[PDB]
Design a protein around this ligand. Structure first.
Ligand code: GLC
Ligand code: GLC
Ligand code: GLC
Ligand code: GLC
Ligand code: MN
Ligand code: MN
Ligand code: MN
Ligand code: MN
Ligand code: MN
Ligand code: MN
Ligand code: MN
Ligand code: MN
Lengths: 385, 385, 385, 385
């Protein structure tokens, strides 16, 4: 199960380069030079990398240090053939962002957050990124009175509408993806799920420039079904990007490697992405645990990819299995894909078979045969057919 | 703290009339006649009641029994002055709806679910209802392969678009509210939160006819902040109705009386509804616990109202308190309500005070003073000023 | 992957005989005659069945109907070779138990609950049961003031101590297992987890008669790791029985078939049970979903067993894999099984290599190699070696 | 509502001295000198402080720097009258503890963890501490195969048994309290709840030396009822210490000030502690949010105390209220405190009123009147009588 660049696997620089600092402990690993991560990931078979501004250029770097960092990184991309499909901004680490960036109560901070983002959009475009992610990790509150949410949503829409004016006036071909998270590091984060992000999009001045970048474990932090959410984002035509990882239930953000956490959910996610022809990057936003040395970091990264390809093969087997096709029919999945009333409203109202003469008892008595189907899915997932 | 009908408190017939059957136990109370609940609630000071079809007219009633039930109920409404501001359909109890109504895999069942809903919309309009709620409690799955979600969302949009054609072609002044629930009785329910419902609305053919009816405990079943959600629904102009109740965290749907559960959340909810001028009904969808006899059912109902009025008084006190106004200013809530860049994009980009000469350290150092504000909110909530 | 009676698979009568009544819906299946379930499960390869009193003998049956029910059931057990290794009492369905059985506030109800249990212990002993389970599903509260917990725990210990006097004075060879559940149908249930049950046991007059019967999904309802809990119960020598099933996170009790829910957790559970030589029954307390007809009920039951045997084979493969043995050593699992200080306290204190001359940095730098090991476990689980 | 030292309020040095570093951000506050925190808290009315070793003496300090730090701290305690009732060890921050201290897989690390703890027990005893807390924040795993739990529990019991030999052989009057946490920073922590800790205690060689130090938000991280847990620990006679704070449901460890989070739970906690005569310290383990400057840190600390005293007054009012006493009787709380069968087993079995002639229907019909009682509790909590 060997990845190739045609699999479009990507990694954040902050992923394999996580040092292991957690709220109760110090770093357990040395910093990695982004050049060195690009080389190592290229060897493992990745397609590309992603970055926040501050991962690539140390906060408070001069225009000339900034130059030199970008040039070195550009050489590593040239030497390995790695691409940069997505970039993002850090509006969460520096103390100035303690109450948010775009929805900080202090106006001067909201202004600075905009300008910091605009500077990186330009960079992202120079390096060939097609999608620009926004994760408002600091947009939220620990207390009720601290954030008037309606005002916050105004400010949030104001910032996104301004980004969108910028990119339109510059003629850039970059689209935006909002990344929802329900909590952590704030007590409650604004736009906490895929639905909240999707709803909010529809209120921007130019909605066609914005989609979502949902993350497996974030939605699972609210106990939601991640494939269902992704199906809703696909149905809206808004799945611009996706972050893949693992989460063991409702608890702090674990960012385990893909396939770890809820495995069956990983299976139905891959089945969905592949059957709906999602063609974007398969981006891993994971942290190798702080128990690991560098060898462990590379093994965790490889494991991400391996588990995708294994789950890709089993889901493909599932759907090609004639016995599965027969069960899908037994379960009336085919009828679900037929319109309920293509005949129209009037015809429905005049059709006695839909009400006055509908046999509710006999309809009630039909089993759905879902358990047989789900065990077929289990046997395929475990390679036990 | 005495309710009056001008408080617009309402109750579902199914609330006080819950018999106490739970998945592990039999009824502990006798059935109540809807006439008797209307009278008792009128005495307690309620404004009105709501109903599913099947609460009012026993499933499988003739056209003439249906007549007689409606006439008796109409007399009780006339005798007490009670209104019926909202109605809804039961598409969840009968076995025929075991895989859903609008998104059942079997097409014939989807058709019947539509016709059952249309019959009640007419009734609801006769009785003066302004809002028609849809709670798709059976729309969902326990397993991955049983429900193609994109197909399901098609079917769901098809049904709502058809309801909306019906009401438009009949000239009715009724609007629809979708009620989200994340799970139970299905393993995962479609449109599981306020955001998912809001997003979905925007894809209907006539969005202006549809809003949400969020329920305190449902959103809390996914660990979300309910006031934040309600602020988002208000911001979208979609809060058509609201169900009030209590939930003790992430667990089965408790439907405790309003004020029970997360009390501070009830406080910030009331503060929001009242400050934003929500003028709809204050509807309680609660179950008096199965430990209670009829006296207990009426005491629980009264408690719903009492807790609203107590939390209304304390939130009003909070916001009128000059020391609170000073703290809100200390916390820069006023600046949050100012546009980040009314000057426009170009002016922002040319303003050196927003970046090149912005003093990040001194901005970083300013405290937000949120803890002082939140303790003011606590002292007001507890009457300890 | 075919079960045999030597696999010791058992089923509750209430499992396959669940009619599908949930809090929002009516039955979707007809009642099954216990004789018919015994025959069908014997065919599927089960070893035995379990029962509450009230599943076997309808509540309010005469001494003579009681006779006739027991005799018919005894014939089915004789005809099929099925055993009854566990029994239990229903102290949760009848209205009289609305505030509990053993910890009801009303004393007369606590007395009746004892006598109802004692009558069934005798029956259980006649039918050859070795373990008698207690699930206090109604012992708890929705509100703070309703249950003085210290008093409740007195009452709870009083009842168990009385059961234990009864069985000792009768000379029965039956042991008791407490089954923890954190909530549902009460807002909070007493002894909500495995640990709480284990702790409580140690306060009974004869602790050696009582262990736990933990259930996969119950512990997962509190977000706990179920294999860790089971390891603690094994370590205490208290795993007398176990209920196997599936749960998709923190939400209502789903009781999905074994292997559904958190699959990786099912894998590490089976690896534990098998490596520690648990020899008790492998008992499924699941509900076939209400979407299913009778064929679906039997397919769900078979699936329970199949998934156990598949996960048994993969865990066995994992532990026999020399590359896994090498990784376990690489991860110092062997050193974990060595005493930290067999040399004793004084020797530890005098050993400079443990402190004054311990090289913390070089110890810090060693990776644990856990990610490589966990991917080996993943490849074995998926059959991808 | 002014605290005095007779209220026995304490604070960890790490609480008010938290700098605000979270997993996604840098410090927002400067470090505080422990001398300065002792003075400021004494002014606010606290009784005392607690410390980990490493809060007081920087890790890697010489024997002489260690001397000088302790002497300065001792002077501040002398100047203010502050006591040190509890101490603890940091076995979680340094990289060496990445896989735990007492249950690290590497034996040499387990040895060092013991010696680091023993050195501080001596210090704690010199400063007058009566309780020594152990929080095994790093004892656990992210993956199944990394930690054999039975072996881990051996190691855990080995370490505690060794601590207990040390203190017994030195003649110290210090007792140990284990502090449970279900997760974070590990994926699952060993002894994740109050019950698991209580159960484990009973397996130590000298159980009478060990109790629990439960923390409000930790138990709430598993969705448990914290007052119920504390009632169980009191019932076992093991509540040696308690950490008070606030948590908004199942999510990362928030450590909000006491009274924030689940307010009603804070109320029933205080009602319990006060009615059962808990005489230990009322210790706050909270973090002032990172939004706050130093003024905010002191306001948050004061708020902790204020909310305790306000909830102390309301619970006291509740229980003295003759109408509440009447309701408690109406709800048969008095009967719950009476033995179920002081008459004994034989008398129960011979008492026909307990079974053959027990009127189950009439018992079933009695309401428990719990909702009236709970609204009395609400009116008292809000000062609305
Ligand atoms: O979206 C940008 C990335 O920023 C941070 O590292 C967030 O924790 C991560 O989840 C997000 O994916
Ligand atoms: O929405 C209609 C009502 O239907 C059912 O009783 C649901 O449980 C309830 O939550 C919903 O509010
Ligand atoms: O323990 C007896 C059995 O009783 C009920 O059916 C409980 O829901 C089940 O979980 C328990 O296993
Ligand atoms: O127990 C010692 C203290 O150590 C750490 O600061 C833990 O996070 C805290 O919860 C615990 O109370
Ligand atoms: Mn994440
Ligand atoms: Mn991400
Ligand atoms: Mn509800
Ligand atoms: Mn509702
Ligand atoms: Mn269960
Ligand atoms: Mn069970
Ligand atoms: Mn904590
Ligand atoms: Mn603590």
């Amino acid at each position: 199960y060997a990845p190739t660049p045609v699999d479009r696997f990507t990694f954040g620089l902050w992923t394999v380069g996580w040092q292991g600092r957690d709220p109760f402990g110090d770093a357990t690993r040395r910093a990695l030079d982004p050049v060195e991560s690009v080389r190592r990931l290229a060897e493992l078979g990745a397609h590309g990398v992603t970055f926040h501004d501050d991962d690539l250029i140390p906060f408070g770097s001069s225009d000339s240090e900034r130059e030199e960092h970008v040039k070195r990184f550009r050489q590593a991309l040239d030497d390995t053939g790695m691409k940069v499909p997505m970039a993002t901004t850090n509006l969460f680490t520096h103390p100035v962002f303690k109450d948010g960036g775009f929805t900080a109560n202090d106006r001067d901070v909201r202004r600075y957050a905009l300008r910091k983002t605009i500077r990186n959009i330009d960079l992202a475009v120079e390096l060939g990124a097609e999608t620009y992610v926004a994760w408002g990790g600091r947009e939220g509150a620990e207390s009720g009175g601290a954030k008037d949410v309606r005002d916050a949503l105004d400010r949030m829409k104001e910032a996104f509408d301004l980004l969108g004016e910028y990119v339109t006036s510059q003629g850039y071909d970059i689209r935006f993806a909002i990344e929802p998270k329900p909590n952590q590091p704030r007590g409650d984060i604004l736009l906490p799920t895929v639905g909240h992000a999707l709803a909010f999009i529809e209120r921007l001045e130019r909605p066609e420039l914005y989609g979502v970048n949902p993350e497996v474990g974030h939605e699972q932090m609210a106990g939601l079904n991640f494939p269902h959410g992704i199906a809703q984002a696909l149905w809206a035509g808004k799945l611009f990007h996706i972050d893949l990882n693992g989460q063991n239930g409702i608890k702090y953000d674990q960012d385990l490697r893909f396939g770890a956490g809820d495995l069956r959910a990983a299976f139905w996610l891959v089945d969905l992405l592949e059957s709906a022809g999602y063609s974007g990057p398969r981006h891993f936003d994971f942290k190798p645990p702080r128990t690991e040395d560098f060898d462990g970091v590379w093994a965790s990264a490889a494991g991400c990819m391996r588990n995708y390809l294994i789950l890709k093969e089993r889901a493909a087997a599932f759907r090609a299995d004639p016995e599965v096709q027969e069960a899908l029919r037994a379960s009336r999945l085919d009828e679900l894909a037929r319109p309920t009333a293509a005949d129209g409203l009037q015809a429905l109202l005049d059709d006695r078979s839909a009400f006055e003469e509908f046999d509710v008892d006999a309809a009630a008595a039909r089993g759905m045969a879902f358990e047989r189907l789900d065990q077929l899915a289990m046997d395929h997932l475990l390679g036990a057919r």
